[PDB]
Design a protein around this nucleic acid. Structure first.
Lengths: 103, 149, 206
RNA sequence: CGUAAACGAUGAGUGCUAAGUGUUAGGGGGUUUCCGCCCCUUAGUGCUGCAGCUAACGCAUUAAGCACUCCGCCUGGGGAGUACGGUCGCAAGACUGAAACUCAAAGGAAUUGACGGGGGCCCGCACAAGCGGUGGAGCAUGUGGUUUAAUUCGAAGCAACGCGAAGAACCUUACCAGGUCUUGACAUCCUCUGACAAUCCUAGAGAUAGGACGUCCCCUUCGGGGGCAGAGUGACAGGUGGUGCAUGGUUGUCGUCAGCUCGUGUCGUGAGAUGUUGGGUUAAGUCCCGCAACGAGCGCAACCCUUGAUCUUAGUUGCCAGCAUUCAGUUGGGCACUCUAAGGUGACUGCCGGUGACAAACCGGAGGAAGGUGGGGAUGACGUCAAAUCAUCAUGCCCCUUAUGACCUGGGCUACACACGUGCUACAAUGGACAGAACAAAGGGCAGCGAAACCGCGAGGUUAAGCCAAUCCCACAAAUCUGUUCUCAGUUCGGAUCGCAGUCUGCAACUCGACUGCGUGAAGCUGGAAUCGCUAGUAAUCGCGGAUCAGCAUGCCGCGGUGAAUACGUUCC
């Protein structure tokens, strides 16, 4: 589109807006439709997402912790949710699992 | 909010002082710098005549006699009505000195404010005078209320 | 003590004069001749739904343009309409009158005809929610970036009269480049007098 | 005595029903003889917490859970823990304990607000810091009472009271008195017959009439039609009659305060909550960051108008730099300059440094005419006061109708013992009087602005140029500056009041106009309690202009002239 509107309305609108909207709407940007499932990293840390997932009846896979509640998560994985190698391992296995799936 | 400050003009064509033009802006009635400049220069010419001195040094001596160290502010707590003494910052020393010169000069009463300002400077030089009653009395009010500081 | 009328606020910024001439020596007389013209023509075509009348003064000649939103009620069969319209104006003014009638496509964006359309429905005893909401849907589909219709008076409720806002979209009365049509209309019902105030933010000019 | 908010406002017993965590008195274990760590178990004592309960607050293994046993107690509030009776008591009283009558509530917990002589933060001429006033006197003006024939009506703390009224002699003007009128002073009707007008005389304060005189209407293919007049007839008119607690419309005020909401979502049984809260920030719900919210709207800001500067165009009626003439910018000449009015450019925290989270923003610097929304204006959110307006208008309802309507003259709205808002002039040497010299802006002018000359002491007058106006006029600016004069007094202060004589406007200045001339010259020598305005070209002061308008301005609305003092600060109102 046109890049010449004001000297700085592109700044005050465009740049300021691109920052927040890109940072928060991420890679769920091109979602276009309701998802089927949901893979989280900590339910206690994120009770809001787990709550409205259980409300919208989306089945959820998830790593939980020993202080978290396994009754709330549909698919419970017990592991470390703040050791980066354990979370890298579990997201690695599940991303390879979904990459082996579309065929 | 915060503090705001003001300005003033440097010279006078005879007697090149800041504060003498500050006295010109003072004692101005109804927006007439011309009458106050006339009163001021005719008064300082009387001060140069009647006492054979330059009137700048006599004028600073009169200021030094009038400039108050200690105002006494107010502080009412409960039913007490206490007055609290304040070390005056020197801008207000000069401006209270000019108010006391101007007010007690025009309160004196002679056959022009030329003569009243001249005789009030001549009295405030050799410290005993009418505005210096107010100087002494403010220092006495600060002396009596010194228990609070 | 409230809002200045936006019509009178944006005169001489973007909205033109309705009455466009220059004063020579009888400015008052030209004004009151044109007030008589606008009264006569708005009474006669308050059946035929005329919103606004722009008057010229062209050295013994007056060009009246008329914004109606339908042509063939007011230009009609050709002969009869221009006879009964130019002829009585030539009489009751005393000089030549030419009449040019521009037709408003999108009849639901001009706030005079919209406010009259809401006023008639109150006089047709249609409920004062249905009038404003129906007309807001009509205006927002006819294409407007905001509409506000406010009706006050005794709404069919006796001993308390109150004001009623319905609106959709932006109606920014403080932006001084706005191009907003404001218009009042009155509706004399059996219970008294109702007042319709409609204003239609249509779009601004950069 | 035998009562306590004697409380955990929670009867005793027992069993069962996640955890985390202090602690008090014990016990046992896993290495160490120890110190001590960990584990395990009791009984007591705290807090947070799952299920469960609950109206909610909350309780939750020390239950307010799930059960069983037993006891005590409750069945609306008051009357009333009253009265009577009995028992106990030295007494005070305790315990037991109603009824007539009376009410449709009393009550719990929570929510939204409002308030607090509760806490926090912030802001505004709100306070302080100053400068000038008002309250005292005189007058101008408006309002209460009171006098009235009428002293028309409307406004009534802030937010009525130099307000509607941006101009009451007549008119306005409604109110009063008297003379009057009755399809009517104003608009549609119906039927006629032609013009209406115009003057003259008489009445009469005039309206209203008697009359005289005068009627010239017209358009067409003959029927008529556009007026105006009367003449009827009845529909109707007419209300500045009431209700702003029936209304529309239009305003004030909080308040240019920064708030007020909605969609979708989620939370809550529900009312509601959320966003909108929190941190910094702002003039700002301004903006950022975090957040169960994401957004949006009306507000805020910005665009709009003005001023601050410069570039281009455009030079006459405006300007005079160099070119000479002029009584004169007058002439020739010129668009440089001012000016004017169009398009621009321009200031955006943009660039630097610093702080702060690096953000948002803040403090200083350079440039610049302009520095941090540059000064001002216009803009007045949702709503609050059943605020104001039925008298600008339009109005629903109610009332009057040969009158609550209409005309005419005269009066009143200007009364006056009193109070009371706003203002003007002074009380004086920074002054008064007299003479000389200069500097403005903005606006008005066609039956209007009116030069110059003449006359008059003067207000002004007569003849008249120019001007539909950047030309000509209003228009001789005033404080100011410079000389002369008085010398601190009720005066060479001040001008009230008043007599006389004038002038202008207009049928007419008596009630009731402004101004001049002569004379008289008063209260007043800076104002009690109390109280108001202003933060910069502002306050103070000085004139000028214009609406309104024949004439009436001390009011209002604008314009320039000179032109300050202070803001430490938020302790207090």
């Amino acid at each position: 589109g046109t890049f010449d509107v004001l000297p700085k309305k592109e700044v005050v609108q465009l740049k300021k807006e691109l920052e927040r909207l890109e940072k928060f709407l991420g890679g769920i940007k091109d979602m276009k439709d309701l998802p089927d499932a949901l893979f989280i990293i900590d339910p206690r840390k994120e009770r809001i997402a787990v709550a409205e997932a259980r409300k919208l009846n989306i089945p959820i896979i998830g790593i939980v912790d020993t202080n978290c509640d396994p009754d709330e998560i549909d698919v419970v994985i017990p592991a470390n949710d703040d050791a980066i190698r354990a979370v890298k391992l579990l997201t690695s296995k599940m991303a390879d699992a979904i990459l082996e799936a579309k065929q | 909010k915060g503090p705001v400050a003001k300005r003033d003009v440097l010279p006078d064509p005879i007697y090149n002082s800041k504060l003498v033009s500050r006295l010109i802006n003072k004692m101005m009635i109804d927006g007439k710098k011309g009458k106050s400049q006339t009163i001021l220069y005719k008064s300082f010419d009387i001060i140069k005549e009647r006492t054979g001195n330059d009137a700048m040094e006599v004028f600073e001596q009169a200021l030094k006699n009038i400039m108050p160290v200690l105002e006494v502010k107010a502080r009412r707590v409960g039913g007490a009505n206490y007055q609290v003494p304040v070390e005056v910052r020197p801008e207000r020393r000069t401006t209270l000195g000019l108010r006391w010169l101007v007010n007690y000069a025009r309160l004196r009463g002679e056959k022009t404010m030329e003569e009243r300002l001249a005789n009030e400077i001549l009295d405030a030089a050799n410290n005993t005078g009418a505005a210096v009653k107010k100087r002494e009395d403010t220092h006495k009010m600060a002396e009596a209320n010194k228990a609070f500081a | 003590g409230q809002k200045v009328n936006p019509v009178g606020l944006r005169i001489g910024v973007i909205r033109d004069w309705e009455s466009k001439w220059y004063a020579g020596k009888d400015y008052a007389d030209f004004l009151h001749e044109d007030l008589k013209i606008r009264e006569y023509i708005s009474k006669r075509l308050s059946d035929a739904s005329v919103s606004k009348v722009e008057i010229e003064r062209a050295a013994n000649r007056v060009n009246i343009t008329i914004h109606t939103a339908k042509p063939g009620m007011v230009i009609g069969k050709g002969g009869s309409e221009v006879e009964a319209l130019r002829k009585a104006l030539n009489s009751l003014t005393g000089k030549r009158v030419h009449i040019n009638i521009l037709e408003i496509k999108r009849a639901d964006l001009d706030a005079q005809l919209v406010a009259d359309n809401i006023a008639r429905q109150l006089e047709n005893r249609v409920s004062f929610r249905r009038a404003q909401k129906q007309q807001i849907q009509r205006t927002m589909r006819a294409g407007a970036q905001g509409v506000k219709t406010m009706v006050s008076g005794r709404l069919g409720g006796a001993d308390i009269a109150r004001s009623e806002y319905y609106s959709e979209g932006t109606v920014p009365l403080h932006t001084l480049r706005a191009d907003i049509d404001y218009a009042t209309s009155e509706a004399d019902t059996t219970y008294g007098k109702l007042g319709v105030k409609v204003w239609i933010y249509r779009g601004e000019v950069l």
